[PDB]
Scaffold this active site. Sequence first.
Site, short mmCIF file in Angstrom:
data_model
loop_
_atom_site.label_atom_id
_atom_site.label_comp_id
_atom_site.label_asym_id
_atom_site.label_seq_id
_atom_site.Cartn_x
_atom_site.Cartn_y
_atom_site.Cartn_z
N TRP A 136 0.83 -1.20 0.00
CA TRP A 136 0.00 0.00 0.00
C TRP A 136 0.86 1.26 0.00
O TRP A 136 1.48 1.60 0.99
CB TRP A 136 -1.06 0.07 1.09
CG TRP A 136 -1.91 1.33 0.92
CD1 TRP A 136 -1.50 2.63 1.03
CD2 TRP A 136 -3.31 1.39 0.62
NE1 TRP A 136 -2.54 3.48 0.80
CE2 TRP A 136 -3.66 2.75 0.55
CE3 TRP A 136 -4.31 0.43 0.41
CZ2 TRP A 136 -4.96 3.17 0.29
CZ3 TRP A 136 -5.59 0.84 0.15
CH2 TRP A 136 -5.91 2.20 0.09
N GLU A 208 7.57 -1.48 2.35
CA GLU A 208 7.25 -1.06 3.69
C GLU A 208 7.99 -2.04 4.63
O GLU A 208 7.96 -3.25 4.40
CB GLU A 208 5.75 -1.20 3.92
CG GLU A 208 4.87 -0.57 2.84
CD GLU A 208 3.42 -0.92 3.04
OE1 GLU A 208 2.91 -1.73 2.28
OE2 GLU A 208 2.78 -0.37 4.02
N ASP A 241 9.32 2.81 2.33
CA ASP A 241 8.17 3.61 2.68
C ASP A 241 7.89 3.48 4.19
O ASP A 241 7.29 2.49 4.61
CB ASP A 241 6.94 3.15 1.86
CG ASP A 241 5.70 4.03 2.08
OD1 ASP A 241 5.77 5.07 2.73
OD2 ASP A 241 4.60 3.65 1.54
N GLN A 244 4.08 4.51 8.25
CA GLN A 244 3.47 4.10 9.50
C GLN A 244 4.47 3.69 10.53
O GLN A 244 4.19 3.66 11.71
CB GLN A 244 2.43 3.01 9.26
CG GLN A 244 1.63 3.28 7.99
CD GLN A 244 0.19 2.79 8.05
OE1 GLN A 244 -0.18 2.04 8.95
NE2 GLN A 244 -0.61 3.19 7.06
N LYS A 270 2.64 10.30 7.39
CA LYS A 270 1.65 10.23 8.46
C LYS A 270 2.14 10.76 9.80
O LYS A 270 1.71 11.82 10.25
CB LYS A 270 1.09 8.81 8.63
CG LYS A 270 0.67 8.09 7.34
CD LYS A 270 0.04 6.73 7.64
CE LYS A 270 -0.88 6.25 6.52
NZ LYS A 270 -2.31 6.24 6.93
N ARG A 404 -5.64 -3.77 13.10
CA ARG A 404 -4.44 -2.97 13.15
C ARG A 404 -4.50 -2.16 14.43
O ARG A 404 -5.43 -1.39 14.65
CB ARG A 404 -4.30 -2.10 11.91
CG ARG A 404 -4.32 -2.93 10.63
CD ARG A 404 -3.73 -2.18 9.44
NE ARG A 404 -4.59 -1.08 9.03
CZ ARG A 404 -4.18 -0.04 8.30
NH1 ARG A 404 -2.93 0.03 7.88
NH2 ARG A 404 -5.04 0.92 7.99
C1 LIG Z 1 2.75 2.65 3.73
C2 LIG Z 1 1.76 3.71 3.33
N1 LIG Z 1 2.19 4.70 2.49
C3 LIG Z 1 1.43 5.71 2.04
C4 LIG Z 1 0.15 5.76 2.48
C5 LIG Z 1 -0.81 6.84 1.93
O1 LIG Z 1 -0.45 8.21 2.15
P1 LIG Z 1 -1.60 9.26 1.83
O2 LIG Z 1 -2.87 8.34 1.74
O3 LIG Z 1 -1.65 10.19 2.98
O4 LIG Z 1 -1.38 9.85 0.46
C6 LIG Z 1 -0.42 4.76 3.34
C7 LIG Z 1 -1.83 4.83 3.59
N2 LIG Z 1 -2.38 4.65 4.73
C8 LIG Z 1 -3.78 4.16 4.77
C9 LIG Z 1 -4.89 5.17 5.12
C10 LIG Z 1 -4.10 3.53 3.40
C11 LIG Z 1 -3.85 3.03 5.73
O5 LIG Z 1 -4.00 1.91 5.28
O6 LIG Z 1 -3.66 3.23 7.02
C12 LIG Z 1 0.40 3.70 3.74
O7 LIG Z 1 0.01 2.64 4.51
#
Ligand SMILES: Cc1ncc(COP(=O)(O)O)c(CNC(C)(C)C(=O)O)c1O
Lengths: 431, 431, 431, 431
Positions: A136, A208, A241, A244, A270, A404
């Site tokens: 993701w 990730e 990436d 999180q 985030k 989660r």
């Molecule tokens: C590893 C990773 N990278 C980028 C993003 C997305 O960034 P933006 O949605 O703020 O553009 C998430 C997404 N987070 C969401 C909201 C999709 C989630 O599943 O918590 C991500 O998990």
Amino acid sequence: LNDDATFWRNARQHLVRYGGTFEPMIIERAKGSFVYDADGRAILDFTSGQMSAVLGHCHPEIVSVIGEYAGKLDHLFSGMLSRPVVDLATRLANITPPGLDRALLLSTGAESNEAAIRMAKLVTGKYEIVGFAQSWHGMTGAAASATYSAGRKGVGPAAVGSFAIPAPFTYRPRFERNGAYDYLAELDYAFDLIDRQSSGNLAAFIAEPILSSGGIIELPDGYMAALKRKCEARGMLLILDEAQTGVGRTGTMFACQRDGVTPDILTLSKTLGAGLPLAAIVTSAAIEERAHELGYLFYTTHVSDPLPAAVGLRVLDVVQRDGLVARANVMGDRLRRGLLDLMERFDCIGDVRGRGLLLGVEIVKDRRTKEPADGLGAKITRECMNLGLSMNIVQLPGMGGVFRIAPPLTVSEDEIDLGLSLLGQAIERAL
Amino acid sequence: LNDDATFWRNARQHLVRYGGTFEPMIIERAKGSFVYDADGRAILDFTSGQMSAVLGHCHPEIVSVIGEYAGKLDHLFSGMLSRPVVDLATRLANITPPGLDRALLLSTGAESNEAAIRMAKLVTGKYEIVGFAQSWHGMTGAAASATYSAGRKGVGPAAVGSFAIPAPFTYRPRFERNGAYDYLAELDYAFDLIDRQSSGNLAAFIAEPILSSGGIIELPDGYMAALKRKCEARGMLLILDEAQTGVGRTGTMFACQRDGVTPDILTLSKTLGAGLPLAAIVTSAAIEERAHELGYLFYTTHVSDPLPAAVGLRVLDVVQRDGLVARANVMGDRLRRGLLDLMERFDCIGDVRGRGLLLGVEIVKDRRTKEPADGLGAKITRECMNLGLSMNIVQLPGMGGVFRIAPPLTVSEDEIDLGLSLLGQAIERAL
Amino acid sequence: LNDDATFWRNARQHLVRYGGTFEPMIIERAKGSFVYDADGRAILDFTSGQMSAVLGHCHPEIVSVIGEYAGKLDHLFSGMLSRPVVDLATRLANITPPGLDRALLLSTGAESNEAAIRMAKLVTGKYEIVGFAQSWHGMTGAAASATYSAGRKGVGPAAVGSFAIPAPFTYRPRFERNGAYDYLAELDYAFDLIDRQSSGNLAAFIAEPILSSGGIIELPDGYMAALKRKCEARGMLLILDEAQTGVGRTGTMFACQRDGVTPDILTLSKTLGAGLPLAAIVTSAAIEERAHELGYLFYTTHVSDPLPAAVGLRVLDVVQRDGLVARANVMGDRLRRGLLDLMERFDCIGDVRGRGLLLGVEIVKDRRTKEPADGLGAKITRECMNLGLSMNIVQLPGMGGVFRIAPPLTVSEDEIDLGLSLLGQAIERAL
Amino acid sequence: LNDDATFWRNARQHLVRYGGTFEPMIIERAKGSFVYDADGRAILDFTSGQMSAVLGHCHPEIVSVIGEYAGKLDHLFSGMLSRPVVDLATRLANITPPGLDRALLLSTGAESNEAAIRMAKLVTGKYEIVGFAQSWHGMTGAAASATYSAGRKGVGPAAVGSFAIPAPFTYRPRFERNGAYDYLAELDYAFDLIDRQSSGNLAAFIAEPILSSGGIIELPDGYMAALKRKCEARGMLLILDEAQTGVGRTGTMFACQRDGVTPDILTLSKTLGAGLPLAAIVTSAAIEERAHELGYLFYTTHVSDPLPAAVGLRVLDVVQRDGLVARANVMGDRLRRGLLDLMERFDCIGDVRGRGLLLGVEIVKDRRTKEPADGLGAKITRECMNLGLSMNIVQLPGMGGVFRIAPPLTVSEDEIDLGLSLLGQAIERAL
Ligand SMILES: Cc1ncc(COP(=O)(O)O)c(CNC(C)(C)C(=O)O)c1O
Ligand SMILES: Cc1ncc(COP(=O)(O)O)c(CNC(C)(C)C(=O)O)c1O
Ligand SMILES: Cc1ncc(COP(=O)(O)O)c(CNC(C)(C)C(=O)O)c1O
Ligand SMILES: Cc1ncc(COP(=O)(O)O)c(CNC(C)(C)C(=O)O)c1O
Ligand SMILES: [K+]
Ligand SMILES: [K+]
Ligand SMILES: [K+]
Ligand SMILES: [K+]
Ligand code: NA
Ligand code: NA
Ligand code: NA
Ligand code: NA
């Protein structure tokens, strides 16, 4: 009451629906690890909003900086430098491993991955991008083409040169050698294929350290190093990436630190903004240098805007000062063990995984068949709410529903116990 | 002094370079139509930052709302609704033309166009996207594939199904019929081609009512209507990108209002946030409905976050209350005429165009050859600075250097005159 | 002498080089299983030319038909029907399994696969195509995008929606379950991935019953059936490429007959023309019907041309009459066993595989390490020539050099023994 | 009688339908400019079959060579050289302009263009290919992506990097400058666009000197030279597709000779084989050299096969000996003028164009509106048949029905007059 008919009327009438379902409550205020409804009911935010409020909701220090700059330096012409920008860039250079020297300050996760991906392609002169089949990375273009956990269908062709490999998943293993799960052999196997389909244009691998949306999948011991080397041999960049995971969440300032493997490009978001829109990429001087030489371009409205920068800075300041990274391990341990006791009681819990304060709980029907719990999740999720605990379960093909869990690094011992309490009640009542 | 060696050292050492060149000054504070350097020198912000500060820098009302919410409702789980979100969605539904009913609140321009583009493809089941050859929609994936003013090279294949048509450019016409520029015939000509290359998957046309980055190119009388119809006949959506034009700038709340043509999807950003990161799309209920039916997905961290929403709301509140849209026309007229007098004096000015407070000045060598002024621009631009006026010139293939002029809707009569003054001095001194 | 300096001069001066290296001899005549050089030396054609001369070189019956039509019906306007065309179409309908009813007569292998692939995409409305990572389907566009044994690099992006899965390779197994090679599990594993990357547009799977260029890889027991079902569940067609296997070569008229799985589209070529350019596809009436309904288009110069058609007809006539399909098994057995005795003598032979008169011999260094024989192949290949036996070795990543053996179905017991003889001498002399 | 119910039954039952409609007759024999039905009726082949039978049907010289080699040298392992191959390669090198030195002998038009296109991409390292919006290059992959006259829809995405420009069409002009059709300005206009969409990977331009399937569109005076230069400036190859024009048809051995512009790669086919499947590309030594250096690959079953080669050779031999190229001009003139007289009589004829013995007749309703004749064409076409003249009309968007006229270079004065006769009768009877 959350029942306000005008509210809901206008909500039904004017909101575009972008995924999932709106919680039937109206949130009026948020403080610490709690959000409050229209009735004043307090909901324990066990997901840090959308996994961002690292310091919790409305962190006095954050508040001040926001107001301190809101009225002093706000938004600027993208060619103008300012102090917060330069101080944040420096800080990032100083707290990330060696080899990571330069930063570009953006606004969103996808935006960050896009800039990284674009720079990779530029620098290498290639365009093929490999990712995990459970990844993701964002909803925008390139970010989305590398996202394989969801959204691939009904929206046309993906970006040219898009490949994926299976992610190492210890719980439900699928690749064996001499009667055992050999996640490395899997890696070798996977890359051979890639190699056979590539057109000779592999430019990067994006990953990730912990597959959040993919179900809290942690990359096992030695993997990243292996990965890195797989890239190295093919003239590919490795883009990590850490949306999180970055900023103390998994017990280290950055997850790549644990493994001891530093990427060519590292993305943050985030957590860096702690609920505000701030994002960034960090790379080596060489890569920046060559990217420059070739005229890298990532010009936006909010690139290098003081307010956010300023905010990102405070957050680092506090994580460091209040020693939240450590804390993460400590409360993490607490929550983890608590999760294990529940698993001791209920058979519907099949796995407890994660790292620090980024934890996952996999619901399963048969704790020996490891058969996904059909709907049971939604139920539990639903009772947690009725009970006053905000949760999030992710559901993917072939796996069980995953909760989660990710509270604020500022979470208290009592809140932890409180969530664990409600979680058990919701479970027992859900069966 | 802006000379701070540590500042510049750390700037050289840790900043990624994303396009153009950093102004050799350090900005310390911003108020109204002015930004101030480290020496305290005041610079007239004739570009509204990166064309966003519609209410100027640090607008007391904005400040309060930001602080008012910074400490009350900040960032939320994407499934949670709140008041500012719903009120903004409604407001947008109420101030945009009929046919535009539902909104999705995002964070950036590219992000907004991406969501729009994605929904278009979903709804239609097609994927080909047509844009102007002088367009600018963003740095991310889909946004970038539709951007033809810059960034197409050295970064790999564009998105599959990407086409462009020439934009109508009255100043330097290239298509003639019975000895005259027939911009419509051009349109017909252009679409025939498209038609011959399409694979039968045209899904949308994306356009700026005024090509900002393209050189302040205004779409001439009847064009949009024609465009619209070209789409209609092919089962295509029309997506209007109003990032620089929306929110009162061109004399109307939205540029599509002037022309009297409402799009299928309308995107907003820069101006909506007034320097903060807020963005949005607005579409018809039907399209939203079908998009829903098909499981549209545009889930992000900052979608439906109260703080920004709240900010977007105030801004509308004030534009309306203070009647800035009108004002736009009034100061616009003032600046326009002032620009014409300069053109009366200097031969290097070949065109004065734009609408409201979104104006362009095209520098040319021969005011009869209409030969681009090579470098002269940079010079003038440079003296404006020395003089205390921030400007921006855009330079494209086959055209002369273009000064994008766009001050705050809150700009004062005196500031206008002041900019006009410095602009003349810079010019004469630049020759 | 093959030494003719003018010949070689003009060869060096005017021939485009398309792959490999030209044999340093001049061929002047060909008869039966032999081709003869300029000195009159006789070379045993153990490769049936480029695996086409199924009836051998200059088969009296072929000769007559060619002359019989050369002067009677030659080439026609693509809209004109003729007898040979219709009789061949019918014959094919009558000798292929049930479910295969209609034919389109073309000129080349790639051409045939292209037409098949195009029809698949049309009919399904999708465009993603999966193939084996060791496949070979042709040099043209779609054919080439599905070819993964060679030619993927330095020529730009492949066709959009191109995927590959590993082929089942019993000799060098790589996927295990409970200590054993589970080629089916591999299949399941592979498709899961595909599924995760598809955009929801899988239209067909294209496969050779025996991977010829891939190293004479035979699909093991149950695979095809499994494959078929994998397709069935996803609304995909199964296109079987029988260019080297069709027309009696592997002991059955068609290889799909052995397995008892009939494809949605079946392609034929090399062998059908017996050295002349004839190709064809055969499909079900329904698929043809829907393809028609939708305006399928595969209009060429040589589609439905009498001469070739006529030739294809004779060939079937003779294979049937002379019972060459049986023969195939009989001489096949002979050659096979002979190959095994050599393996009994030399350690450089690691595997003897294939079916009928489509056999492969894998050269390896360590018959326990199964380590590829580096160059040894070229040597042997080279001595076979010096000795008077034409051979062909294919060399792929991770495998040992493979001798593709495929003599004419008209081959004699003595020729078989003769090749086996020279083959041994070349080997022993090569060490 | 053509009525044979079994014939038609089996035709309906087993033939795949690939475009258009089957002529309701059965052809039994072909000689000279005539094909004969089952009743013995003689049909004047005014289309040379599918524009290939350059020497007519069953040309005694062709017959002999075919039989002469059918029984002597037939098909060979792609690595083996033979005399006919080398002699043809040389001949081609000797009769094409200077700069064209090396040849690759294939089997089909699309196959030839594919090999050319592939080599272009290899050599340049780029992949974008530009063609005419009214082009026709083949049904296979790359050939088909560059074909814009038909087949773009319902079969999925085209190849990545595919662009088209409008072809110069003097009859129905669409681009004007100072009240006149400026086909060059059009070219400049067109390329500017291309330039704005390219990703920096333009590799070649592929063009027919005369758009056959496009409606017999001849490129006007100076165009090719201009084109060539447009390519030169962008580091692009120019690939000229002479499938219908090569081999004497338009009055010169090759059409590029007239214009005096030699391409980087030249492709031949239809006419080269005179009804048999032979094709080829011819390029410069340098390009071949670099293509080699980089490992160009175009390995097929029929590349360098003696029989066809041999046939191609005879054909050149005869065209030269019998001075058919001249003849072309002479009978061409005859037919042309005859066509003009009809135009003198009937108003339905709006244009008579072409060159040599490659002529087009555009049917129009209003000879002043130049309004396409709806169906009238089909009618005439239909009466020509009833009358004993085989014709072909092509129908494209925005143009009138076009009769492609192209008899054998061996056509007689009487046959010419005969066709002209029937053509008039069909016309008058069709009204
Ligand atoms: C590893 C990773 N990278 C980028 C993003 C997305 O960034 P933006 O949605 O703020 O553009 C998430 C997404 N987070 C969401 C909201 C999709 C989630 O599943 O918590 C991500 O998990
Ligand atoms: C019409 C239009 N749409 C979207 C955007 C980009 O939005 P973001 O860069 O904030 O993602 C611009 C850009 N503005 C820049 C900074 C490129 C400018 O040229 O002023 C734009 O002009
Ligand atoms: C299964 C299969 N299908 C199609 C083809 C190619 O057909 P054409 O090359 O005649 O167009 C081959 C190739 N045969 C070559 C010459 C590549 C070989 O390796 O023997 C093939 O193996
Ligand atoms: C310029 C040109 N190039 C290649 C080809 C096709 O070659 P093949 O169809 O033999 O592969 C044509 C087609 N000829 C057809 C049959 C399409 C026609 O329209 O006459 C062509 O016109
Ligand atoms: K900025
Ligand atoms: K949110
Ligand atoms: K034909
Ligand atoms: K050959
Ligand atoms: Na560092
Ligand atoms: Na509205
Ligand atoms: Na059958
Ligand atoms: Na020459």
